[PDB]
Design an enzyme around this catalytic site. Sequence first.
Site, PDB file in Angstrom:
ATOM      1  N   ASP A  89      -0.530  -7.322   1.809  1.00 31.54           N
ATOM      2  CA  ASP A  89       0.108  -6.005   1.880  1.00 31.54           C
ATOM      3  C   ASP A  89       1.603  -6.231   2.082  1.00 31.54           C
ATOM      4  O   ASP A  89       2.105  -6.195   3.217  1.00 31.54           O
ATOM      5  CB  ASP A  89      -0.501  -5.166   3.013  1.00 31.54           C
ATOM      6  CG  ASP A  89      -0.116  -3.710   2.939  1.00 31.54           C
ATOM      7  OD1 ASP A  89       0.501  -3.277   1.934  1.00 31.54           O
ATOM      8  OD2 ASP A  89      -0.430  -2.985   3.897  1.00 31.54           O
ATOM      9  N   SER A 119       3.960   2.676   8.586  1.00 35.87           N
ATOM     10  CA  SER A 119       3.622   1.659   7.582  1.00 35.87           C
ATOM     11  C   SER A 119       4.796   1.192   6.731  1.00 35.87           C
ATOM     12  O   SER A 119       5.652   1.983   6.348  1.00 35.87           O
ATOM     13  CB  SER A 119       2.506   2.160   6.652  1.00 35.87           C
ATOM     14  OG  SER A 119       1.240   2.054   7.274  1.00 35.87           O
ATOM     15  N   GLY A 120       4.804  -0.097   6.410  1.00 31.61           N
ATOM     16  CA  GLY A 120       5.879  -0.702   5.632  1.00 31.61           C
ATOM     17  C   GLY A 120       7.068  -1.068   6.510  1.00 31.61           C
ATOM     18  O   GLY A 120       7.922  -1.875   6.113  1.00 31.61           O
ATOM     19  N   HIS A 140       0.806  -1.210   0.000  1.00 32.92           N
ATOM     20  CA  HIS A 140       0.000   0.000   0.000  1.00 32.92           C
ATOM     21  C   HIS A 140       0.843   1.266   0.000  1.00 32.92           C
ATOM     22  O   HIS A 140       0.373   2.324  -0.434  1.00 32.92           O
ATOM     23  CB  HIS A 140      -1.017   0.001   1.147  1.00 32.92           C
ATOM     24  CG  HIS A 140      -0.471   0.450   2.465  1.00 32.92           C
ATOM     25  ND1 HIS A 140      -0.003  -0.429   3.421  1.00 32.92           N
ATOM     26  CD2 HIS A 140      -0.375   1.684   3.013  1.00 32.92           C
ATOM     27  CE1 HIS A 140       0.378   0.250   4.492  1.00 32.92           C
ATOM     28  NE2 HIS A 140       0.164   1.535   4.269  1.00 32.92           N
TER      29      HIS A 140
HETATM   30  C1  LIG Z   1      -7.844  -2.811   5.939  1.00 33.97           C
HETATM   31  C2  LIG Z   1      -8.934  -1.782   6.283  1.00 33.97           C
HETATM   32  C3  LIG Z   1      -8.338  -0.551   6.891  1.00 33.97           C
HETATM   33  C4  LIG Z   1      -8.821  -0.048   8.121  1.00 33.97           C
HETATM   34  C5  LIG Z   1      -8.276   1.114   8.686  1.00 33.97           C
HETATM   35  C6  LIG Z   1      -7.226   1.750   7.995  1.00 33.97           C
HETATM   36  N1  LIG Z   1      -6.673   2.930   8.565  1.00 33.97           N
HETATM   37  C7  LIG Z   1      -7.487   4.037   9.067  1.00 33.97           C
HETATM   38  C8  LIG Z   1      -6.456   5.135   9.378  1.00 33.97           C
HETATM   39  C9  LIG Z   1      -5.143   4.379   9.554  1.00 33.97           C
HETATM   40  N2  LIG Z   1      -3.988   5.143   9.119  1.00 33.97           N
HETATM   41  S1  LIG Z   1      -2.569   5.216   9.907  1.00 33.97           S
HETATM   42  O1  LIG Z   1      -2.729   5.960  11.135  1.00 33.97           O
HETATM   43  O2  LIG Z   1      -1.700   5.697   8.884  1.00 33.97           O
HETATM   44  C10 LIG Z   1      -2.002   3.648  10.385  1.00 33.97           C
HETATM   45  C11 LIG Z   1      -1.963   3.363  11.696  1.00 33.97           C
HETATM   46  C12 LIG Z   1      -1.500   2.126  12.302  1.00 33.97           C
HETATM   47  C13 LIG Z   1      -1.668   1.766  13.680  1.00 33.97           C
HETATM   48  C14 LIG Z   1      -1.081   0.492  13.953  1.00 33.97           C
HETATM   49  C15 LIG Z   1      -0.514  -0.062  12.850  1.00 33.97           C
HETATM   50 CL1  LIG Z   1       0.301  -1.598  12.727  1.00 33.97          CL
HETATM   51  S2  LIG Z   1      -0.652   0.906  11.458  1.00 33.97           S
HETATM   52  C16 LIG Z   1      -5.352   3.128   8.716  1.00 33.97           C
HETATM   53  O3  LIG Z   1      -4.498   2.396   8.247  1.00 33.97           O
HETATM   54  C17 LIG Z   1      -6.755   1.230   6.782  1.00 33.97           C
HETATM   55  F1  LIG Z   1      -5.761   1.834   6.134  1.00 33.97           F
HETATM   56  C18 LIG Z   1      -7.292   0.092   6.213  1.00 33.97           C
HETATM   57  N3  LIG Z   1      -9.787  -1.454   5.087  1.00 33.97           N
HETATM   58  C19 LIG Z   1     -10.905  -0.541   5.395  1.00 33.97           C
HETATM   59  C20 LIG Z   1      -9.087  -1.001   3.854  1.00 33.97           C
END
Ligand SMILES: C[C@@H](c1ccc(N2CC[C@H](NS(=O)(=O)/C=C/c3ccc(Cl)s3)C2=O)c(F)c1)N(C)C
Lengths: 52, 230
Positions: free
Chosen positions: B85, B182-183, B42
């Site tokens: 992912d 992420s990653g 992603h």
């Molecule tokens: C897989 C699912 C999904 C749910 C929630 C998210 N969200 C919502 C916001 C969030 N963004 S983030 O703050 O950049 C990532 C935070 C993390 C907390 C702990 C991690 Cl391990 S990664 C995130 O990744 C998503 F990207 C994807 N789907 C709806 C696509």
Amino acid sequence: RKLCSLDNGDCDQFCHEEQNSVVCSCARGYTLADNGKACIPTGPYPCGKQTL
Amino acid sequence: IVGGQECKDGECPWQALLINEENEGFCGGTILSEFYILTAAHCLYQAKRFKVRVGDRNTEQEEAVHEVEVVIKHNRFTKETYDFDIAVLRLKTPITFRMNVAPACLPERDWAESTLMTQKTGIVSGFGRTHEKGRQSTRLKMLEVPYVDRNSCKLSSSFIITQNMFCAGYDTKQEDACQGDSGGPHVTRFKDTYFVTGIVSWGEGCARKGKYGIYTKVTAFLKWIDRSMK
Ligand SMILES: C[C@@H](c1ccc(N2CC[C@H](NS(=O)(=O)/C=C/c3ccc(Cl)s3)C2=O)c(F)c1)N(C)C
């Protein structure tokens, strides 16, 4: 617990059970030691070691 | 990372940072060898062109910048559920290992599942936010995160947790990965050696109560990773 389920079969890294006897192995960049359990880095900067 | 402690000299040497054209970090990655970085698929959508920075702990004081030659994305990744992912980056120039720059080990699948994923905790790290609404951290951070029972994890999640994923972190205690992480690396320590076990994937915000961090289960793609490298 026996073989690999017992303290990783005394191996430093990978533990497999073959013919009901522990066989140890190491990630890449390591050589299995003479004792057949310990893993020795071939070079500098072997994988998974903090560089302190 | 929200909570956790700063990575001290040589403690997180396998950390990689993906930087956009403005030298800004948007995602992490894990150093797998002199030419290969592991990251989340992603992440490949969050910037047109990007480079890989390693050996960096403080994004203000100068580290080595590498360019990407080949981006190998898992064909089955879907933005819809974040399944598969995972991606592997091959670099144009080999990484020079040195203090603070070193690869994390890749475990064997069976041993990883029975021995690494059954440990109490793992360690996630990165340059992402220190609070859900804050900005990217300038210091590399690390955080010890407990493995979460698979049952609890599914119950806690508003979305589907596939077999290519796992949960780590705390039910309520306020420590978690966050945006920018992420990653990045999720590694598990065994007798003083660190093995890649996860890729920071997604979460319903950061550190929210009753929620966990969701990681790509590296054991599920070991062969794929080997093939990606060879
Ligand atoms: C897989 C699912 C999904 C749910 C929630 C998210 N969200 C919502 C916001 C969030 N963004 S983030 O703050 O950049 C990532 C935070 C993390 C907390 C702990 C991690 Cl391990 S990664 C995130 O990744 C998503 F990207 C994807 N789907 C709806 C696509």
